[PDB]
């Protein structure tokens, strides 16, 4: 029958199926504890006492607002400023040898640390002048995108920024805000945030891009999904554009058309 709020094998498997067809995220049995913990909060928020009740309301109403909250609950958004640091110097030298507006796409922006790390690198290497560069960042998670839009972070989290970067691109909070920092609007102006599901058969993005950052997100997808997205990226890259993967990813594995050109960096042809 049940237990005081219990997740049954049957419900876990339905949840696994539902999240896979909406976000492409492959959940495993060793994550059944995170699932339960992340999801009972949604049950409580709504006043439901049953996962089957919860699951059924979702299935019966495909346009339910709860669908976005269900997705947000199951995504893992761990990120950090200047994560996989070696990528930024590479991005800088590449942009410096190119002309025209340099456009980058952060395909899994999370709370904004990645898209702002890219903006800082480019403002430092290219300068901040209208039409010099632009960053497009997206994510399926509307909650994290909202955090990213605000651009407020904990000062203790910026361990990787030089004092010159802080002085140049952030405002420091004082009084009730002490300990917080806020990306200046002048730099935020060069970053566009939107929601884009990588499972889409067609991306609603302003490309082509000189570079695409797709880090630490493919790891949640299965084999054919990974190859499909990789194939969707190809026509989105400018001639000598770059594709950056996370530390764990190997793209030349699914499509040889991508060649390794540095620490988890790839170029086409």
């Amino acid at each position: 029958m049940t237990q005081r709020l219990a997740l049954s094998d049957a419900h876990f498997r339905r949840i696994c199926q539902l999240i896979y067809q909406r976000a492409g995220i492959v959940l495993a049995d060793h994550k059944r504890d995170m699932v339960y913990n992340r999801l009972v909060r949604r049950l409580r928020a709504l006043g439901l006492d049953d996962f089957g009740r919860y699951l059924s309301m979702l299935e019966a109403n495909q346009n339910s607002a709860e669908w976005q909250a269900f997705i947000n609950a199951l995504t893992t958004n761990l990120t950090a400023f200047f994560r996989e640091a070696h990528h930024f110097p590479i991005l800088a030298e590449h942009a410096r040898r190119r002309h025209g507006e340099y456009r980058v796409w952060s395909a899994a922006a999370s709370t904004g640390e990645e898209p702002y790390s890219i903006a800082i690198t480019l403002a430092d290497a290219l300068g901040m002048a209208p039409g010099r560069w632009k960053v497009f960042a997206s994510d399926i998670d509307t909650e994290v995108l909202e955090k990213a839009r605000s651009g407020i972070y904990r000062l203790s989290e910026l361990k990787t920024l030089s004092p010159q970067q802080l002085q140049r691109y952030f405002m420091r909070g004082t009084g009730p805000h002490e300990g917080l920092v806020r990306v200046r609007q002048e730099l935020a102006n060069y970053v566009e945030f939107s929601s884009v599901n990588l499972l889409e058969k067609q991306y609603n993005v302003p490309g082509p891009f000189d570079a695409i950052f797709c880090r630490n997100v493919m790891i949640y997808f299965d084999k054919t999904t990974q190859e499909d997205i990789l194939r969707r990226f190809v026509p989105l890259l400018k001639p000598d554009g770059l594709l950056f993967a996370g530390h764990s990813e190997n793209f030349s594995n699914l499509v040889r058309e991508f060649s390794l050109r540095g620490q988890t960096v790839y170029a086409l042809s």
């Binding site: 004092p163 802080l166 002085q167 952030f170 405002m171 420091r172 909070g173 004082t174 009084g175 805000h177």
Partner: peptide
């Protein structure tokens, strides 16, 4: 409030 570094 907020200020420069």
């Amino acid at each position: 409030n907020w200020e420069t570094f």
